[PDB]
């Protein structure tokens, strides 16, 4: 009662609740509903919009839509209708504003290439580069440099030049790029069933797998098409060095951002289990390999089709050797002089690899120094949870759940046997843990059909649920925090109009640091929560 | 409790359901004011209507 928490603003809205405020926190206005309604109901048509939103028809419809396009906030499909002409139905990009939802953290992705110029105007340069990019999202050095002054050495005003390529940075949006993945797989599922030279009408398996093969291997060069394209990378005009292709607009490259932050986690978790010497070694080693590892990207194909209880493994096996061998060529065998702050003899000092043991790494070419990879990242992921509940709720929940890990569907005696303290606490910690997810429940009929108190009560992990509940977390501040940010705007909104155009009153002076360092608390507090959220949303 | 099995613990889906249950006889079937009831007796010299 009395709105102070306001469960309305909160409790009843899964998932999209983030989105519709993000775009709101971005635009709102006309642009708010279309994404909200979209993610709500799913597939939607232009004509189909205004029969729901009442959204200023076929203007803000068109306007907001092309807005999202420019910023690639939607997934975008068109095809002929079944009678003819052409029809356009729409989805929402990835997590979309997910791009925006990092931003300053994507700004931190620069801090990898903060190197080679440290604390320079070059820093501010690449800064305005990136955010100008990300505000529009697709630009050319022809368009950008065009807007930029043409009196500052071309190969310097825009100093990031060859550095435009690297791993992250930009890739031209093409066709499939923001096109919905789940279907465009089905689009490739054509031309194989669709091209059958009336071969034999038996065993669709021979039709399927082969089509699958095609569907597989065709899709590969499909997604490998953005992975690298030389016409960008290669161009070296006369009396010049190698440049990108200034012609086509390129767009933020999200992959190496994923792999980068996931790295940062591994710096933390590994850093937890090893020493800062061995740690920083692992840290600088990963700086090379984070180039090559998809690490969130592999799903792709898994997303968009039913597995098969065998063929699921027929995907898993591909992930077993993939990075381990062929990208293993790109991976650690002998690396030389990474940084050093240590000094003097660097060799057995570099044999500190073998100090890696558990629960990860520590697999090499039996006498070259190498870390397992495409096998590593997967069983690494499974471990990543660990600490996630301790002062989350209670210390004792750890050991039991951890124990609940090793054993499975046991019961309280065998708990209290294995466990310690008192049933007075054991129930509490357990019960206060069962209040959401974790343990779930198991029970079996005891000398009855099914009855209330007869049977036995058992406990289970099911990280499927667990790893899939931490979105409730997303529903906490990533839900809320954005509001009390926005809600605090209308507080100073009057002053916000004036105070922004000024560069007056004592309370103004006070509430400056209040609302502002307040914004430090919210935004920083967010990114705090984000570093945690960086996992269960993807792997 | 009791526990000699008092039959009509039921209060609700019932009160909305059948016969005297509202949504037929107590709502569409309202028992309406301004009326009167008596027995009959013939009056031929009274006109029809």
């Amino acid at each position: 009662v009395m709105t102070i928490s306001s469960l309305e603003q909160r409790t009843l809205n899964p998932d999209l609740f983030l989105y519709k405020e993000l775009v709101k926190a971005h635009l709102g206005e006309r642009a708010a509903s279309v994404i909200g309604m979209l993610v709500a109901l799913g597939r939607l048509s232009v004509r189909e919009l205004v029969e729901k939103i009442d959204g200023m028809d076929v203007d803000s419809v068109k306007t907001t839509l092309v807005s999202l396009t420019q910023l690639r906030c939607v997934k975008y499909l068109q095809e002929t209708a079944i009678s003819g002409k052409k029809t356009t139905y729409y989805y929402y990009n990835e997590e979309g504003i997910h791009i925006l939802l990092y931003s300053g953290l994507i700004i931190d992705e620069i801090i990898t290439q903060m190197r080679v110029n440290d604390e320079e105007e070059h820093k501010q340069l690449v800064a305005e580069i990136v955010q100008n990019v990300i505000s529009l999202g697709s630009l050319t050095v022809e368009d950008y440099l065009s807007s930029v002054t043409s009196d500052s050495m071309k190969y310097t005003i825009s100093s990031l030049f060859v550095q435009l390529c690297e791993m992250g940075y930009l890739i031209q949006i093409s066709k499939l790029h923001y096109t919905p993945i789940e279907d465009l797989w089905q689009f490739l599922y054509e031309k194989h069933y669709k091209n059958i030279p009336r071969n034999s009408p038996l065993s669709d398996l021979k039709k399927r797998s082969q089509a699958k093969m095609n569907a597989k291997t065709d899709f590969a060069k499909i997604i490998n098409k953005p992975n690298e394209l030389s016409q960008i990378l290669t161009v070296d005009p006369k009396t010049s060095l190698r440049i990108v292709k200034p012609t086509v607009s390129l767009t933020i490259n999200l992959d190496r951002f994923m792999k980068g932050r996931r790295s940062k986690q591994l710096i933390n978790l590994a850093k937890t289990r090893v020493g800062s010497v061995t740690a920083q070694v692992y840290k600088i080693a990963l700086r090379l390999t984070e180039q090559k590892s998809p690490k969130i990207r592999d799903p792709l194909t898994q997303t968009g089709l039913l597995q098969d209880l065998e063929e699921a493994k027929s995907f898993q096996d591909e992930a077993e050797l993939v990075e381990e061998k062929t990208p293993g060529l790109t991976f650690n065998a002998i690396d030389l002089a990474r940084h050093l702050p240590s000094a003097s003899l660097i060799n057995s000092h570099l044999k500190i690899l073998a100090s890696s043991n558990f629960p990860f790494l520590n697999e090499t070419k039996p006498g070259v120094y190498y870390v397992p990879y495409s096998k590593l990242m997967p069983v690494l992921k499974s471990s990543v949870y660990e600490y996630v509940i301790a002062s989350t709720l209670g210390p004792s929940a750890m050991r039991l759940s951890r124990c609940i890990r090793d054993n499975k569907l046991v019961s309280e005696k065998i708990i209290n046997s294995t466990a310690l303290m008192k049933e007075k606490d054991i129930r509490s910690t357990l019960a206060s843990l069962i209040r959401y997810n974790s343990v779930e429940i198991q029970e079996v009929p005891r000398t009855a059909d099914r009855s209330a108190s007869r049977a036995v009560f058992l406990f289970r992990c099911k990280e499927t649920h667990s790893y899939n509940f931490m979105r409730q977390n997303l529903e906490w501040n990533m839900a809320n925090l954005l509001f009390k940010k926005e809600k605090l705007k209308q507080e100073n909104s009057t002053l916000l109009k004036k105070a922004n155009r000024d560069d007056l009153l004592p309370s103004e002076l006070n509430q400056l640091k209040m609302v502002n360092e307040r914004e430090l608390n919210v935004f920083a507090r967010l990114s705090r929560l984000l570093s945690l959220w960086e996992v269960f949303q993807m792997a | 409790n009791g526990g000699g099995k008092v039959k009509p613990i039921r209060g609700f889906c019932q009160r909305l359901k059948g016969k005297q249950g509202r949504f037929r006889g107590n709502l569409s079937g309202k028992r309406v004011d301004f009326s009167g009831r008596t027995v009959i007796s013939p009056d031929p010299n009274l006109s029809i209507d």
Binding site: - | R24, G25, S28, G29, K30, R31, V32, D33, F34, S35, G36, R37
Partner: protein, 50 residues
Amino acid sequence: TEGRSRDGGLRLGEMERDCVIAYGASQLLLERLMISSDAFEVDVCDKCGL
């Protein structure tokens, strides 16, 4: 209230009611099943009708 004794009121049953519909009398329903039956005004809200 119910029947004779305590005090009056008389029974329009459904089977009794619908006989009026065969004559299709609009208002006779209202005066009968409404204005003389339970006289009430609900106050509501266009937005989120309640």
